[PDB]
Design an enzyme around this catalytic site. Sequence first.
Site, PDB file in Angstrom:
ATOM      1  N   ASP A 161       0.821  -1.217   0.000  1.00 22.48           N
ATOM      2  CA  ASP A 161       0.000   0.000   0.000  1.00 22.48           C
ATOM      3  C   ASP A 161       0.856   1.269   0.000  1.00 22.48           C
ATOM      4  OD1 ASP A 161      -2.327   1.551  -0.052  1.00 22.48           O
ATOM      5  OD2 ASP A 161      -2.674   1.373   2.110  1.00 22.48           O
ATOM      6  N   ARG A 165       0.171   9.199   1.209  1.00 26.02           N
ATOM      7  CA  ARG A 165      -0.593   9.189   2.475  1.00 26.02           C
ATOM      8  C   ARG A 165       0.048   8.273   3.522  1.00 26.02           C
ATOM      9  NH1 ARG A 165      -3.461   6.475  -1.228  1.00 26.02           N
ATOM     10  NH2 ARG A 165      -3.463   4.193  -1.003  1.00 26.02           N
ATOM     11  N   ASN A 166       0.877   7.339   3.056  1.00 28.63           N
ATOM     12  CA  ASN A 166       1.569   6.398   3.928  1.00 28.63           C
ATOM     13  C   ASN A 166       3.022   6.789   4.188  1.00 28.63           C
ATOM     14  OD1 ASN A 166      -0.088   4.395   5.104  1.00 28.63           O
ATOM     15  ND2 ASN A 166      -0.266   3.285   3.156  1.00 28.63           N
ATOM     16  N   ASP A 179       2.402   2.155   7.465  1.00 31.73           N
ATOM     17  CA  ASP A 179       1.188   1.563   6.940  1.00 31.73           C
ATOM     18  C   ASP A 179       0.064   1.888   7.911  1.00 31.73           C
ATOM     19  OD1 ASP A 179       0.257  -1.801   5.789  1.00 31.73           O
ATOM     20  OD2 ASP A 179      -0.866   0.086   5.854  1.00 31.73           O
TER      21      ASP A 179
HETATM   22  C1  LIG Z   1       0.699  13.310  12.690  1.00 33.30           C
HETATM   23  N1  LIG Z   1       2.018  12.702  12.946  1.00 33.30           N
HETATM   24  C2  LIG Z   1       2.145  11.392  13.195  1.00 33.30           C
HETATM   25  N2  LIG Z   1       3.340  10.895  13.579  1.00 33.30           N
HETATM   26  C3  LIG Z   1       3.479   9.596  13.832  1.00 33.30           C
HETATM   27  C4  LIG Z   1       2.383   8.739  13.700  1.00 33.30           C
HETATM   28  C5  LIG Z   1       1.145   9.249  13.295  1.00 33.30           C
HETATM   29  C6  LIG Z   1      -0.017   8.454  13.162  1.00 33.30           C
HETATM   30  C7  LIG Z   1      -1.260   9.101  13.171  1.00 33.30           C
HETATM   31  C8  LIG Z   1      -2.426   8.348  13.055  1.00 33.30           C
HETATM   32  C9  LIG Z   1      -2.348   6.964  12.943  1.00 33.30           C
HETATM   33  N3  LIG Z   1      -1.170   6.348  12.943  1.00 33.30           N
HETATM   34  C10 LIG Z   1      -0.010   7.045  13.049  1.00 33.30           C
HETATM   35  O1  LIG Z   1       1.188   6.386  13.041  1.00 33.30           O
HETATM   36  C11 LIG Z   1       1.296   5.048  12.767  1.00 33.30           C
HETATM   37  C12 LIG Z   1       1.337   4.614  11.438  1.00 33.30           C
HETATM   38  C13 LIG Z   1       1.478   3.253  11.147  1.00 33.30           C
HETATM   39  C14 LIG Z   1       1.621   2.321  12.179  1.00 33.30           C
HETATM   40  N4  LIG Z   1       1.740   1.004  11.917  1.00 33.30           N
HETATM   41  C15 LIG Z   1       2.583   0.413  11.057  1.00 33.30           C
HETATM   42  N5  LIG Z   1       2.682  -0.914  10.997  1.00 33.30           N
HETATM   43  C16 LIG Z   1       3.588  -1.207  10.072  1.00 33.30           C
HETATM   44  C17 LIG Z   1       4.075  -2.429   9.611  1.00 33.30           C
HETATM   45  C18 LIG Z   1       5.040  -2.450   8.606  1.00 33.30           C
HETATM   46  C19 LIG Z   1       5.514  -1.250   8.072  1.00 33.30           C
HETATM   47  C20 LIG Z   1       6.570  -1.275   6.968  1.00 33.30           C
HETATM   48  F1  LIG Z   1       7.715  -0.849   7.463  1.00 33.30           F
HETATM   49  F2  LIG Z   1       6.734  -2.516   6.491  1.00 33.30           F
HETATM   50  F3  LIG Z   1       6.187  -0.458   5.992  1.00 33.30           F
HETATM   51  C21 LIG Z   1       5.026  -0.022   8.540  1.00 33.30           C
HETATM   52  C22 LIG Z   1       4.055  -0.001   9.545  1.00 33.30           C
HETATM   53  N6  LIG Z   1       3.415   0.991  10.179  1.00 33.30           N
HETATM   54  C23 LIG Z   1       1.586   2.756  13.514  1.00 33.30           C
HETATM   55  C24 LIG Z   1       1.713   1.833  14.559  1.00 33.30           C
HETATM   56  C25 LIG Z   1       1.697   2.266  15.886  1.00 33.30           C
HETATM   57  C26 LIG Z   1       1.544   3.622  16.182  1.00 33.30           C
HETATM   58  C27 LIG Z   1       1.415   4.544  15.145  1.00 33.30           C
HETATM   59  C28 LIG Z   1       1.438   4.121  13.807  1.00 33.30           C
HETATM   60  N7  LIG Z   1       1.076  10.579  13.068  1.00 33.30           N
END
Ligand SMILES: CNc1nccc(-c2cccnc2Oc2ccc(Nc3nc4ccc(C(F)(F)F)cc4[nH]3)c3ccccc23)n1
Length: 300
Positions: A161, A165-166, A179
């Site tokens: 994805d 936006r990501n 993600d």
């Molecule tokens: C507004 N600024 C800001 N800063 C940091 C985080 C956020 C945020 C706002 C709303 C919802 N989520 C946010 O951050 C997250 C994005 C994705 C998350 N999850 C995630 N899970 C992932 C698993 C894999 C990978 C890969 F590296 F493979 F791309 C990326 C991944 N990202 C979050 C998990 C825990 C806490 C926050 C997460 N917002």
Amino acid sequence: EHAERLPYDASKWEFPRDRLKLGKPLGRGAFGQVIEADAFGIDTCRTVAVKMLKEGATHSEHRALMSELKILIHIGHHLNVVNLLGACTKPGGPLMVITEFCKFGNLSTYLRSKRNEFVPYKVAPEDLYKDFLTLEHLICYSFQVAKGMEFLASRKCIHRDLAARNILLSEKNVVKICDFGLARDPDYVRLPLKWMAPETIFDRVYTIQSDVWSFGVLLWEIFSLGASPYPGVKIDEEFCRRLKEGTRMRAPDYTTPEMYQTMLDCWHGEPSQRPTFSELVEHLGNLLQANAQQDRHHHH
Ligand SMILES: CNc1nccc(-c2cccnc2Oc2ccc(Nc3nc4ccc(C(F)(F)F)cc4[nH]3)c3ccccc23)n1
């Protein structure tokens, strides 16, 4: 699968719930919600984003969040992947997954906010362009995402994805791949079709090379300063037909010729003929160096 079963180094990752000051909501999902917080001693005070499991969550929901935590731990640290900082897993409160806070939020929204604050490059006096985006910034973001994706590929991951936006923007122009889990919204047709390679749309094939296609669309997003892909086009069977036939987006408003060719390359019909992320890192790094160094004004 069953990533939730992986060994957990609590000495490394576990953070006390009472060392968090919980702040404004950042977003909500099926899991519960993500909230801004200040964390004390997580590495001092540091602002973080905390994903917390809702009360009364199902076993599957709970398992899913623990799996996510373990997946982030397994992948490991990279500058250009959202940084996992800690978790709260022990009894006495909700399951919480803590990542670094990225001040400027998602890249699409940010770039859209900068359309009156962009110049191809600064000219002296540079104070006329304080905090402006430049081509150097845009190529730099592109390079960083490619680096992040190269890293994810080396970890045997497929994003599935990839889109502006990501991407999160932090300080010092550092971008971070995340993600938000929106597949699990106008960008998603009840599937992020505008970002999907033809083999993904028609045959549900996901590979690192389909991520490369998505990266091409992400490049278009960057060099349009956050426009929505395929303007003026309804995403239906005719869109898919034309994509199969070789129709591609026109050059966005802020692109260089080289960057547009790179988009076209990423959008090759044949997955094997698309550049690899390693090739993209090399190419974009070289384009960035040329851009960053070409003005010799300050270098007499
Ligand atoms: C507004 N600024 C800001 N800063 C940091 C985080 C956020 C945020 C706002 C709303 C919802 N989520 C946010 O951050 C997250 C994005 C994705 C998350 N999850 C995630 N899970 C992932 C698993 C894999 C990978 C890969 F590296 F493979 F791309 C990326 C991944 N990202 C979050 C998990 C825990 C806490 C926050 C997460 N917002």
